[PDB]
Amino acid sequence: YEIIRTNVQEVLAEIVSPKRFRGIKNVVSRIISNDKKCRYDLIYNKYLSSSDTRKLKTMIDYSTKFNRVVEVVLIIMGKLLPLDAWGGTENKKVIQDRIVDFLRLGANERLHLDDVLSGIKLSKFKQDFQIRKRLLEGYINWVFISLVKNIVRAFWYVTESSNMDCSKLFYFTHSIWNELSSNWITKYAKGNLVQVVSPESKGQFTNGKIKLIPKRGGFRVICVPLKQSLYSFNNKRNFALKQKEKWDYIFYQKYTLSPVRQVLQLKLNALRKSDMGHRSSVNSTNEVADRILTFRNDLLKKNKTLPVLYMIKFDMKECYDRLNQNALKESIAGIFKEDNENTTYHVREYGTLDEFLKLKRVRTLIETVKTLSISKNKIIEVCHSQIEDATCLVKNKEGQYDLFKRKQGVFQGFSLSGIFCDILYSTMVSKEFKFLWEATEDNLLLRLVDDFIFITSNKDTLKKVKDKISSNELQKYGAFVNHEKTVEINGEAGSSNKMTFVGLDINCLTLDVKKDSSQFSRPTCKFRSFKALFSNLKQFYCSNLCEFLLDFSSNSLETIRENVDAILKLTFEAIQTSFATISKQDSFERYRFMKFLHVIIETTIEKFARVNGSMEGVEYLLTCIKITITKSLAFMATKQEIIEWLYTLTIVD
């Protein structure tokens, strides 16, 4: 069914980017005519379509196994491309291995034609021919992004999991995906949503589109904002309207959302530094470790010895789903209580990813103020609009796309959801745990977004915490404690002494803090050359830099940076480890290494701005990437030129 949607005239234009160049026209013709005479339905019926629809344990089980996916892909590619189109016989296996590695990324990530291009000149058009062989780049680029990618899109819906570790992607067939998703959503809506009768003019802003993510026995619902109105989503052929409403969103994102996001963060940051109750809130994993190791050091100083300690961890059941919208709207007014609303705030104007790629060219990282005004009035209006008016689109199963609203709570995926949850729980914590903010000597409460840990040496103040979490007093805010996941240890030589809180291992007697197995698994750095090492690490970094790690609508920049630093630390430690072994047989070249760094840094920025669509945070993130790489290269004896080059990179103006 036409896996190739362009004619021979179009494919050759793609290859020869601006005749006795006919051998290519010959190959493309056979590939295109093979695509039409290919069945594509006996292949689907043979390997795929799994017509045993018995209720399985986990959603993931419905996915097509990666080995079956590769088998299908390569069997299609084998029919499509004749023996010569593969550049020979050994080149064929080489490219197939590169296709597999491209399938591990889900065929979505950016293709790099330097790793994949490792063939020879035995492709007889399938002194200075070499420099003129940049046609092979266009051919191979056409094979991967136009044939492999379109085969994947044809048969499977590709998504990662929520269960964990986020690199292993799952290929669900379209027929089984639409059936699972439609039935879950229809059930989810009845028990959690309520439809909306009449739309309104500001619909390009509050409309969302549902994206599902497999949770062990179900799904996790994310809401992707629609960059258009409900009208143009049903009128799918009025392309002029969608482009106008798309820029409507871009300007709404640029001048309305981003300012509101910035001011709420300022108020929240001016509470962590000013209010005792807000100092228990913490923005990142490493900040938990640092505050614990500081608390430990305070005890050692203040007491000369560590006393017997009592710690308990608890978390909130579905903090976004059950969030109390009214308790939130009061929290928002609270941090504005002294502002006498006609006061105006001046924040920076940040760019948009769509502004970069639509209006100009690529390679946003070059080797070489603009403030806005927003009023508190408008801020409260936008916050209320996102809380009250946020609607999603659900398939009516006959193609009608009704618009539903949350009965309670906020959608995860809207640009303000994450900071909303931060404002409400910070306000909550500072209000209900009043009795711990003036005795920080021997009690510590720490909050990551919906995870809590309380360490103390006081059996009586431990009861007060256990009495509040066992009470309804927190339900008013929408925080329902996950009582079945609450763990308590004290370490009195009869009690357990270990506890894993946020991916850290904490000892109850020594207050030792560690990292739980470094969940971004071993980078496998046993290679003979530096080029071979950098290619492997480039694959590791891209596949382990998951999108959910860079989402600003759900995590704070501080935690986004620390997830970056985590992948960087593991990437470079594999260089530090194997440098002496490799350097014995292959000479380190700083310029090949700099190109490797340049790819790592560009991928991080490009992926960040693709996930958030808003350049806010790229400059701050870029400078932090410099520092992390500087610190991770300390072992490098001579790195002056590398570092000098590193510090010259900037984002495109």
* Residues β-bridged to residue 281: 447
Q: In sequence order, which residues have a C-beta less than 8 Å from that of residue 134 and are 6 or more positions away?
A: none
CATH number of the CATH domain containing 123: 1.10.132.70
Query: CB–CB of 462/516 below 8 Å?
Result: no
Nearest Cα neighbor of 259 from 374, 344, 387 is: 374
Torsion region of 556: left, alpha or beta (phi above 0 gives left; psi -120 to 50 gives alpha): beta
- B/e letters for 260-283, b = 16+ CB within 10 Å, e = fewer, are bbbbbbebbeebeeebebbbbbbb
- B/e letters for 495-508, b = 16+ CB within 10 Å, e = fewer, are eebebebbbbebbb
Query: CB–CB of 313/481 below 8 Å?
Result: no
Q: Which helix (H) or strand (E) holds 222?
A: strand 218-225
Q: Report in angstroms the alpha-carbon separations of 618 from 204, 381, 495, 596, 626.
A: 26, 28, 47, 19, 12
Q: In sequence order, which residues have a C-beta less than 8 Å from that of residue 185 and are 6 or more positions away?
A: 210, 212, 221, 394, 395
Nearest Cα neighbor of 264 from 424, 429, 391, 372 is: 424
Instruction: Name the structure determination technique.
Output: X-ray
Query: CB–CB of 62/163 below 8 Å?
Result: no
Q: How far apart are the first and last CA of the chain?
A: 44
Q: Report in angstroms the alpha-carbon separations of 36 from 5, 29, 44.
A: 11, 11, 16
The Cα–Cα gap between 67 and 195 comes to: 42
Hey, CA dihedral for 135, 540, 161, 220, is it positive or negative? negative
Q: Report in angstroms the alpha-carbon separations of 239 from 41, 224, 242.
A: 32, 20, 5
Q: Which helix (H) or strand (E) holds 170?
A: strand 170-173
Pairing of strands 193-195, 310-315: unpaired
Describe the crossing of helices 325-334 and 417-432 by its angle, rounded to 10 degrees.
80
Q: Which helix (H) or strand (E) holds 139?
A: helix 134-142
| CA-based R_g, the chain, Å | 28
Query: CB–CB of 13/25 below 8 Å?
Result: no
How many other β-carbons are positioned within 10 Å of the β-carbon of residue 376? 16
How many other β-carbons are positioned within 10 Å of the β-carbon of residue 459? 10
- B/e letters for 382-391, b = 16+ CB within 10 Å, e = fewer, are bbeebbeebb
Describe the crossing of helices 530-544 and 590-612 by its angle, rounded to 10 degrees.
10
- B/e letters for 194-226, b = 16+ CB within 10 Å, e = fewer, are eeeeeeeeebbbbbbbbebbbeeeebebbbebb
The whole domain housing 27 covers 8-171
The Cα–Cα gap between 444 and 466 comes to: 14
Q: Hey, is 575 helix, strand or coil?
A: helix
- Alpha-helical (H) ranges within 371-450 are 376-388, 417-432
Measure the CA angle with vertex 327, ends 324 and 329; round to 5°. 105
Query: CB–CB of 227/383 below 8 Å?
Result: no
Q: After which residues are there C–N gaps above 2.5 Å in the chain?
A: 18, 126, 368
The Cα–Cα gap between 62 and 175 comes to: 11
The Cα–Cα gap between 544 and 567 comes to: 7
Q: In sequence order, which residues have a C-beta less than 8 Å from that of residue 191 and are 6 or more positions away?
A: none
Measure the CA angle with vertex 296, ends 292 and 298; round to 5°. 115
The Cα–Cα gap between 196 and 492 comes to: 57
Describe the crossing of helices 618-632 and 557-583 by its angle, rounded to 10 degrees.
30
